[PDB]
Design a protein around this ligand. Sequence first.
Ligand code: HEM
Length: 153
Amino acid sequence: GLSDGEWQQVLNVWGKVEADIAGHGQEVLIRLFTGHPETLEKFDKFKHLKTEAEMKASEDLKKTGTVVLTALGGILKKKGHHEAELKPLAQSHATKHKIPIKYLEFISDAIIHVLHSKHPGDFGADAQGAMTKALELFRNDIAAKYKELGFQG
Ligand code: HEM
């Protein structure tokens, strides 16, 4: 999917996320959750959250943001060589959590969103470029694993 000039850009950018993994992860789930409320319903431990103050105020969400961004970061550093790390992922979201690929689209968008909000002006057009393709490659490989499982819905 990507050139290493592009990989280069992705890890450049992930350097931003790693300086504050907990904050980045919190705002991603908040951007996910507030924009597409049906997504909250897939989490039984965040179901109670009703307002953004509550989410904001929730320590368990900051926690889940770190797990999520820690796992993706683990995949991105593989530079597309991630069958081993993604299968387990795709299996769990399809069979156990029942997560529609559309939701993986929403969170992909939510990361691009967040990044511009936290780093206005230092999230280059080129960087957006690389990051979007990287998220697409991630999403595409999951989509395939999802097809195998007939995880239609
Ligand atoms: C970049 C995308 C994502 C990554 C890297 C990610 C990562 C993870 C990891 C590492 C776990 C725990 C281990 C496991 O169950 O496999 C997990 C659990 C879970 N994920 Fe995701 N996830 C992603 C997207 C999503 C989305 C979009 C949703 C729903 C809109 C979601 C819903 C859940 C749920 C419900 C669980 C179980 C939560 C619990 O522990 O109670 N995930 N995810």
